[PDB]
Structure formats: structure tokens, C-alpha cells
Amino acid sequence: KYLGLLLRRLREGYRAVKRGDLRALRRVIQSYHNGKWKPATAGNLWLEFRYG
């Protein structure tokens, strides 16, 4: 079940990627840092998903 949950969160991130958005794509990014991460500049879709 935990694997299924992980895959669901990944699917959410990918769907965000497909629809296209840089800020809304961070829905999952905020689910790991355990902190209020702030931006620094203008990122990119695949950049904020390949290893983000």
C-alpha cells in the first residue's frame, strides 16, 4: 500500500508536468523538504522533476 501511495504521488507530479506549470508542480516538492522552501529564479518543468 505504501508503494501504491508513492506511485500515486509520482503520478500527481507527472500529471502536473504534463498539464504544464512551474509553481503548482511543487505540490510534492513541499512533501519532502519538511520546510518552507523558497524559490531563487525561474526554473523549468523537467528540471524541477528530473531530480527535484
Binding site: 526554473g43 523549468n44 528540471l47 528530473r50 531530480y51
Partner: protein, 132 residues
Amino acid sequence: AKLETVTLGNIGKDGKQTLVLNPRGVNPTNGVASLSQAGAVPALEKRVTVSVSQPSRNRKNYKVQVKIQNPTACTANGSCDPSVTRQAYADVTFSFTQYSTDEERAFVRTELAALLASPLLIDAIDQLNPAY
């Protein structure tokens, strides 16, 4: 973002081996690049990962990391699947104060290069001998 091909030369003791490293991507988390040899095999492809950091909160100095893998690719391994037997780790780490200079960085850079090229470090890295 590093997307440059590096055509290395003077590899090995004989100095007659040459290598080429082609970029493979960038890791948009820690400011890391990636470069590899031309091929399609982990053992035959040598890894070069450079990384550059900036101060955020945990530290107040830069960090230039460099990790090179030179796996030993064996030919005869029971089939046409060259595997790895000896993994060659080469880890380099730097730390520069935010008030340092390009001059100072180049100074350490060239001193490192010259020591590596001289017969000083060759005896300790290849033949494995202590400072008599």
C-alpha cells in the same frame, strides 16, 4: 549547466592514451553535471561528475566537488558482456571562503595540477609508498 565535450589526453604512465567525455545531463538539485565516455557499457564508460554549491544556511563557504569513476572493464567474462571488477574512485573536494578570489582559486587549481603532473604524487598514488 555544463554541456561541453572534453577531449582529454596524456592518459596513463605512457601518456599515449586519450579519452573523450561527452555530457550526459545535469542534476537540478545540487548543481551537478555529468560526463561520460562514448560507448554503451558502464565499465567501458568513465564517469566524471562535477558539482558546484553556493552558501545557503548550513555552511558559509563554497564547495567544488569532483567524482571520477574509472571502472576496469574486463573483456572475457563468459559472454560478450564486459563487466566491472575494480571500481576506480577519485573524489576531490574544495572549500573556498566567500571572500576569496579567482586568483586564489586559480592558484590552488594550478598547484594541484602541477603536483599531480610531477613525480611527487605519482609514487604515492601508483606505487603506494610513504614519505621516507
